[PDB]
Amino acid sequence: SSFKAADLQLEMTQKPHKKPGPGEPLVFGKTFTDHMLMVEWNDKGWGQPRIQPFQNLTLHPASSSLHYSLQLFEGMKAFKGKDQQVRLFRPWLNMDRMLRSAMRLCLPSFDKLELLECIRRLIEVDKDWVPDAAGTSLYVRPVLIGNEPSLGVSQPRRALLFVILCPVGAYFPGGSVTPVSLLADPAFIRAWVGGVGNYKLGGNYGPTVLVQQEALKRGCEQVLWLYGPDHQLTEVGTMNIFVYWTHEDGVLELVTPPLNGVILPGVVRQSLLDMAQTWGEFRVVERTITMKQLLRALEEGRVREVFGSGTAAQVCPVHRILYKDRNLHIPTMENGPELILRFQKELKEIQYGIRAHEWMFPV
Amino acid sequence: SSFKAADLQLEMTQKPHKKPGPGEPLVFGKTFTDHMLMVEWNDKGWGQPRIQPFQNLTLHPASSSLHYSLQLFEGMKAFKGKDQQVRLFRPWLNMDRMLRSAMRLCLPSFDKLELLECIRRLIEVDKDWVPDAAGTSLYVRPVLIGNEPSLGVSQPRRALLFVILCPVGVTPVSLLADPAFIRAWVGGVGNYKLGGNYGPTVLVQQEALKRGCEQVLWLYGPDHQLTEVGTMNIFVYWTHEDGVLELVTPPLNGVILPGVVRQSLLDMAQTWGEFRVVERTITMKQLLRALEEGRVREVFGSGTAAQVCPVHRILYKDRNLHIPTMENGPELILRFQKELKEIQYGIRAHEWMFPV
Ligand SMILES: *Cc1c(COP(=O)(O)O)cnc(C)c1O
Ligand SMILES: *Cc1c(COP(=O)(O)O)cnc(C)c1O
Ligand SMILES: CN[C@@H](CC(C)C)C(=O)O
Ligand SMILES: CN[C@@H](CC(C)C)C(=O)O
Numbered sequence: 039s040s041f042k043a044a045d046l047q048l049e050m051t052q053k054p055h056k057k058p059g060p061g062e063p064l065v066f067g068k069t070f071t072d073h074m075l076m077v078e079w080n081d082k083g084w085g086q087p088r089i090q091p092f093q094n095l096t097l098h099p100a101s102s103s104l105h106y107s108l109q110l111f112e113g114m115k116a117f118k119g120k121d122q123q124v125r126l127f128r129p130w131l132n133m134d135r136m137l138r139s140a141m142r143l144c145l146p147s148f149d150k151l152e153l154l155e156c157i158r159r160l161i162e163v164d165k166d167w168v169p170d171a172a173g174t175s176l177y178v179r180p181v182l183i184g185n186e187p188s189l190g191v192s193q194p195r196r197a198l199l200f201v202i203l204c205p206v207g208a209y210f211p212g213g214s215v216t217p218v219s220l221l222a223d224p225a226f227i228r229a230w231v232g233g234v235g236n237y238k239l240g241g242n243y244g245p246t247v248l249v250q251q252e253a254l255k256r257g258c259e260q261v262l263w264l265y266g267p268d269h270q271l272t273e274v275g276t277m278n279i280f281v282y283w284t285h286e287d288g289v290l291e292l293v294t295p296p297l298n299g300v301i302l303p304g305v306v307r308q309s310l311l312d313m314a315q316t317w318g319e320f321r322v323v324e325r326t327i328t329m330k331q332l333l334r335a336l337e338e339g340r341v342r343e344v345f346g347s348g349t350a351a352q353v354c355p356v357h358r359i360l361y362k363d364r365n366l367h368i369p370t371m372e373n374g375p376e377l378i379l380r381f382q383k384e385l386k387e388i389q390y391g392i393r394a395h396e397w398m399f400p401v
Numbered sequence: 402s403s404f405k406a407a408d409l410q411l412e413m414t415q416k417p418h419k420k421p422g423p424g425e426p427l428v429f430g431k432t433f434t435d436h437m438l439m440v441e442w443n444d445k446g447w448g449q450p451r452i453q454p455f456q457n458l459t460l461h462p463a464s465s466s467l468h469y470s471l472q473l474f475e476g477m478k479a480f481k482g483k484d485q486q487v488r489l490f491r492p493w494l495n496m497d498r499m500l501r502s503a504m505r506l507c508l509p510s511f512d513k514l515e516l517l518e519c520i521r522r523l524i525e526v527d528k529d530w531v532p533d534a535a536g537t538s539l540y541v542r543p544v545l546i547g548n549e550p551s552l553g554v555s556q557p558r559r560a561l562l563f564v565i566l567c568p569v570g571v572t573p574v575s576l577l578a579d580p581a582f583i584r585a586w587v588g589g590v591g592n593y594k595l596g597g598n599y600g601p602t603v604l605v606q607q608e609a610l611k612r613g614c615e616q617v618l619w620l621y622g623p624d625h626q627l628t629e630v631g632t633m634n635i636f637v638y639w640t641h642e643d644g645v646l647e648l649v650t651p652p653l654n655g656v657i658l659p660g661v662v663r664q665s666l667l668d669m670a671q672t673w674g675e676f677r678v679v680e681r682t683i684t685m686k687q688l689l690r691a692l693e694e695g696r697v698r699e700v701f702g703s704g705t706a707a708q709v710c711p712v713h714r715i716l717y718k719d720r721n722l723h724i725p726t727m728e729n730g731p732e733l734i735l736r737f738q739k740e741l742k743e744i745q746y747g748i749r750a751h752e753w754m755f756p757v
Contacts, residue, residue: 067463067552067553068550068551068553070463074462092462094459094461095459095460095461095462095464096457096458096459097457097458097460099433099458099544099563100430100433100542100565101458104458104466104472104544104596105474105542105596106596106599106603107470107472107595107596107598107599108603109468109470109600111468141604142604143600143603144603179463181462187431188428188429188430188431189429189431189540190428190429190430190431191599191602191603192603192606193603193607202462202463204552225588226588227587227589230583230589231583232580232582232583233583233586233601234601239597239601240467240469241595241596241598241600241601242470242597243468243469243554244470244472244506244547244595244597245505245506245589245590245595245597247469247471247506247507247554247556248504248505248506250554250555251507251556276554
């Protein structure tokens with residue numbers, strides 16, 4: 039059976055790390071908090087969860103996490119409002135997704151609410167690490183790895199679940215929203231139908247490093263991931279893609295690719311779909327978007343805004359796509375960006391507790 | 402830029418571990434030797450290579466190797482003959498493949514021959530761990546991982562290269578051929594020995610066992626191309642549609658891992674010059690037709706760990722397909738096995754063997 043949060047043991051740090059403080063530039067994932075969550079699994083089932091001081095992992099050289107990528111991760115944020123209250127954004131969805139990833143890699147199942155309570159207690163211990171300046175947050179990184187001391191490609195008989203925390207700064211410092219330019223080359227493929235692109239597995243990210251460097255050498259910020267002979271737009275780097283346009287039928291709509299296997303089911307992606315549907319001002323649909331559909335809409339002036347969504351960036355505008363050595367201008371910023379700014383404002387007000395919402399979970 | 406074997410640090414173990422051998426079946430890669438190789442990389446370059454006692458790794462919890470699969474591995478075997486001398490089978494090809502895997506993941510470059518010398522020195526220290534019994538050898542496992550204490554998906558500013566050794570040790574296999582499962586794709590990374598290509602295969606292997614099959618026959622594309630058998634390369638020995646007797650294996654188009662045993666079987670069969678030996682796409686349509694016409698002689702898998710693995714049944718589209726491999730000898734498999742063992746255990750001298 040699963041580990042219980044009621045069995046959670048707490049060991050406080052004797053050697054605290056020095057906090058950067060307000061004003062100092064926080065770089066994404068480079069600064070770590072004082073404590074971490076740790077829970078072991080073996081043949082006797084799950085062990086008791088422990089909050090221990092931030093320390094290195096001791097792994098056997100043959101650990102299946104290092105040889106056969108029996109690893110998965112999650113990413114969510116904890117936000118601190120002006121009245122010092124810390125809240126998590128739709129953590130249940132990350133727990134749901136984490137369990138789906140675990141099943142795909144034959145890693146041990148756990149109870150979603152027990153892990154959520156373990157993470158809640160961890161953030162509570164390191165509460166003073168959560169920043170409160172505009173746009174800042176505490177990035178939560180749960181990881182589940184196989185830890186079997188065997189070179190045989192099989193289901194691990196030993197595993198480890200750990201959670202580390204990182205205080206992160208504003209993605210758009212000062213509040214000014216800035217766009218990204220994308221490289222669209224069909225030679226590089228992120229995922230395939232029948233593959234594992236719809237799960238947050240470590241294996242899906244390592245191969246993207248070389249492609250991202252090629253995008254940077256070409257003058258772009260990120261990569262537009264194309265799929266199939268029809269060049270279907272799937273992801274923008276590690277973000278889901280959205281297009282706000284007047285469709286071929288003349289109806290104003292917000293479209294994002296459907297969950298067909300090559301798309302990672304983003305929490306922010308689902309939130310934008312839910313929010314747009316609640317307003318009921320325009321059509322909201324999940325449908326395949328191709329490069330030829332994009333080209334046709336751009337020359338006819340039908341495209342209003344194109345953007346990426348994800349925990350790190352929340353909502354990120356796209357102004358340029360380098361496709362077939364030609365620069366395609368996306369008029370996102372000239373159009374406000376009206377919808378992006380509305381999405382960002384509503385998300386900001388919900389996340390920092392200015393507006394009450396069922397999406398928030400208090401710590 | 403590369404680490405030098407001349408800069409090798411030796412520590413030597415105080416109180417050695419228990420050495421196995423015959424009697425006990427000995428399961429693959431669960432028993433380890435006394436020493437390991439360790440080399441560290443940072444922004445200023447590589448450090449000194451170390452042969453230190455077998456011990457656990459100490460990794461920062463944000464190590465890119467654990468979050469974004471910045472990891473790769475290799476697999477080669479060391480054999481001990483009757484003259485008690487240890488020899489590695491075509492290790493230069495493994496060094497070549499490792500450097501290609503490193504480049505694909507933006508991991509640090511190294512001199513292939515300096516690593517080979519460091520590995521030779523490691524096996525020389527643990528020379529008594531290499532078994533001499535029939536069908537046994539020492540499995541060499543080199544690994545290169547990203548090790549930067551950062552959560553950003555980027556080129557690592559830190560890395561760790563380590564090599565661990567394992568003393569390791571017939572019946573045909575049944576395969577499940579279901580198109581719904583994809584191992585690798587064109588434009589992907591299936592042609593590199595990266596950890597990421599292996600984790601997803603575990604569930605598929607369990608699904609094969611549920612349907613009564615021992616391993617997975619990986620299919621690709623609309624035309625259902627045969628690619629790999631589990632984590633082995635596939636070979637079909639048949640009388641082709643043109644009437645010529647041939648040995649065929651899928652070509653290196655991006656979805657096939659370029660195996661050393663695969664290349665060796667092609668090279669050996671090429672030298673014989675008795676039948677046609679080609680690298681060409683094999684489809685299920687071509688295989689189905691050939692089985693019903695009785696043209697298929699043998700089907701097998703190839704790999705360092707698995708050697709030459711016979712196939713007797715393929716379950717494709719809810720239909721059982723008997724592969725007459727064991728009823729045809731298996732003539733070619735037994736010939737490949739005897740010639741490989743002669744080269745490997747030093748009964749016959751070859752350019753393929755590297756003396757330790
Ligand atoms: C994490 C991720 C997303 C976005 O997910 P969020 O849960 O919204 O943070 C989108 N695409 C990919 C490929 C991702 O890895
Ligand atoms: C290791 C491996 C092989 C075989 O390679 P060898 O070098 O001959 O050991 C074949 N296919 C896959 C997927 C492999 O991982
Ligand atoms: C900037 N993006 C985060 C999460 C990705 C991998 C989904 C990171 O680099 O960890
Ligand atoms: C058929 N042989 C297995 C491996 C041995 C080590 C049990 C395989 O190739 O999967």
